[PDB]
Scaffold this active site. Structure first.
Site, mmCIF file in Angstrom:
data_model
loop_
_atom_site.group_PDB
_atom_site.id
_atom_site.type_symbol
_atom_site.label_atom_id
_atom_site.label_comp_id
_atom_site.label_asym_id
_atom_site.label_seq_id
_atom_site.Cartn_x
_atom_site.Cartn_y
_atom_site.Cartn_z
ATOM 1 N N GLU A 54 0.839 -1.217 0.000
ATOM 2 C CA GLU A 54 0.000 0.000 0.000
ATOM 3 C C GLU A 54 0.868 1.259 0.000
ATOM 4 O O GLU A 54 1.965 1.329 0.594
ATOM 5 C CB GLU A 54 -0.950 0.010 1.147
ATOM 6 C CG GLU A 54 -0.302 -0.068 2.462
ATOM 7 C CD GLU A 54 -1.058 0.620 3.585
ATOM 8 O OE1 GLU A 54 -1.355 1.810 3.469
ATOM 9 O OE2 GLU A 54 -1.198 -0.011 4.641
ATOM 10 N N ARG A 65 -2.465 11.491 6.167
ATOM 11 C CA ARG A 65 -2.577 10.617 4.996
ATOM 12 C C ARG A 65 -3.936 10.559 4.261
ATOM 13 O O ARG A 65 -4.039 10.027 3.195
ATOM 14 C CB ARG A 65 -2.162 9.213 5.391
ATOM 15 C CG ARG A 65 -0.691 9.117 5.740
ATOM 16 C CD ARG A 65 -0.245 7.698 5.968
ATOM 17 N NE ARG A 65 -0.244 6.907 4.776
ATOM 18 C CZ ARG A 65 -0.482 5.601 4.736
ATOM 19 N NH1 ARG A 65 -0.928 4.939 5.804
ATOM 20 N NH2 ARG A 65 -0.366 4.958 3.628
ATOM 21 N N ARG A 69 -5.479 5.713 -1.474
ATOM 22 C CA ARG A 69 -4.309 4.800 -1.496
ATOM 23 C C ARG A 69 -4.280 4.086 -2.848
ATOM 24 O O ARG A 69 -5.282 3.870 -3.517
ATOM 25 C CB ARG A 69 -4.437 3.677 -0.410
ATOM 26 C CG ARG A 69 -4.723 4.105 1.009
ATOM 27 C CD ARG A 69 -3.488 4.565 1.773
ATOM 28 N NE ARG A 69 -3.772 4.950 3.166
ATOM 29 C CZ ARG A 69 -4.121 6.158 3.577
ATOM 30 N NH1 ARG A 69 -4.366 7.118 2.730
ATOM 31 N NH2 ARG A 69 -4.270 6.370 4.886
ATOM 32 N N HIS A 85 -10.364 4.502 1.977
ATOM 33 C CA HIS A 85 -9.657 3.855 3.071
ATOM 34 C C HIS A 85 -9.863 2.330 3.006
ATOM 35 O O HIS A 85 -10.061 1.688 4.034
ATOM 36 C CB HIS A 85 -10.009 4.457 4.421
ATOM 37 C CG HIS A 85 -8.846 4.619 5.399
ATOM 38 N ND1 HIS A 85 -8.907 5.413 6.529
ATOM 39 C CD2 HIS A 85 -7.595 4.139 5.368
ATOM 40 C CE1 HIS A 85 -7.752 5.371 7.168
ATOM 41 N NE2 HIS A 85 -6.948 4.574 6.475
#
Length: 96
Positions: A54, A65, A69, A85
């Site tokens: 990731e 963050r 991703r 997420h």
């Protein structure tokens, strides 16, 4: 399950940045970049531990963050985007 396929150009521009850092093997902005993604809930196809890794897709203005991703799979040209997420994913198509 994977929601479908998405062109890279239809993703946020930060996704392109993240893929460029993955291609250069870093350096990465976050210490968590490159960690194994366990895929604990088998949203992605079930594979051996270490198949997936990731990386943060930076969210403009987010203190840290955020929730976007990229997950790499070990196969060539296998990459997934999540904006939520890890709840949902789309396969990234770097050709478009």
């Amino acid at each position: 399950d994977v929601s479908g396929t998405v062109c890279l150009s239809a993703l946020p521009p930060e996704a392109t940045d993240t893929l460029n850092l993955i291609a250069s093997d870093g350096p990465f902005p976050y210490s968590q970049d490159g960690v194994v993604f366990q895929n604990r809930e088998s949203v992605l196809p079930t594979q051996s531990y270490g198949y997936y890794h990731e990386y943060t897709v930076i969210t403009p203005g987010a203190r840290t963050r955020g929730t976007r991703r990229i997950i790499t799979g070990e196969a060539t040209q296998e990459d997934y985007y999540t904006g939520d997420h890890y709840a949902t994913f789309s396969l990234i198509d770097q050709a478009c």
